[PDB]
RNA sequence: UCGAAGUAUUCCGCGUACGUU
RNA sequence: CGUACGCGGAAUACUUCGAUU
């Protein structure tokens, strides 16, 4: 009850914003660089705002009601590629989600945005090595389709 | 429309898993519904008891707008079964079937498959359908190409 | 991009009931 | 596996509103 309760999803929702640490575990080892209203705005620069080559993607972890999400820049490059995959690891998200499971299993999604494209994984809790595992192929191939 | 009984398309849609069909409907699959009766399913169940492995096959739909299908192939994990399941459905039978129930106002439009307990969603507007279809047939490769 | 409201879907988890039409 | 509801979430599409003078 404790676990899993609306008085930890709220600070798992609020840890999307801080800088590099906020008051409780999260699955990702990058922090949330996500563009001010502005800076997204005058992202109609020569271009479609959402479209083409947006200014990076979403993706989220859940565990149960616990959910984290975070936005990272992409710039279609390898070395932002590989900046952006190591956004989270097997080791990171079970980490995370032994903090957060155990018990009655629940629902788990690891989900992804780019390029008006979505990719969500679910299961249960117990399948969590196979969602991971699923999820970074995904996540992988997302990001260097074209 | 859809039209005019916006929900009636819907209805035949989801009776296509089972009619032929039957109907006139048009399908995104070119290959049949492989659903394991009742009796089949529990028996399937007792060669190595478990819950997760082996599974006899796997379930996928396709949904444009409101417009839901589905099939549940048999797969035993072999090349020559997944060539097969591979062909469950290709680039053009998803949009020759959208072309049918897509109009200009843009609408959601969704791929799923559950395989191992695991589900893989693909999801956009219809006017990235094509970009779901690259996205989701190989997305599909993956679920199926995997081990416990 | 962030937040909130609504509408139409999809998916996962848990629980209940009914099943070779 | 199929069907119907219940609960808790996620994702997508569309509409509306708000966002350092």
Redesign the interface.
Same mark, same amino acid.
């Given at each position: 009850r404790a676990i899993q309760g609306n008085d930890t999803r709220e600070q798992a929702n609020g840890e999307r914003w801080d800088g590099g640490s906020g008051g409780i575990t999260s699955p990702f080892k990058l922090p949330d660089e996500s563009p001010s209203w502005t800076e997204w705005r005058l992202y109609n620069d020569e271009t479609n705002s959402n479209q083409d080559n947006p200014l990076g993607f979403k993706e989220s972890w859940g565990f149960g009601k616990v959910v984290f999400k975070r936005y990272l820049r992409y710039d279609r490059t390898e070395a932002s590629l590989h900046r952006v995959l190591g956004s989270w690891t097997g080791d990171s998200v079970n980490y995370a989600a032994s903090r957060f499971l155990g018990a009655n299993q629940v629902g788990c999604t690891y989900s992804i945005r780019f390029?008006?494209?979505?990719?969500?994984?679910?299961?249960?809790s @117990?399948?969590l090595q196979? *969602?991971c595992?699923?999820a970074i @192929?995904?996540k992988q191939? *997302?990001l260097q389709?074209t």
């Open positions: 390029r008006g494209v979505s990719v969500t994984i679910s299961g249960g @117990r399948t196979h *969602l595992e699923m @192929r995904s191939e *997302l389709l």
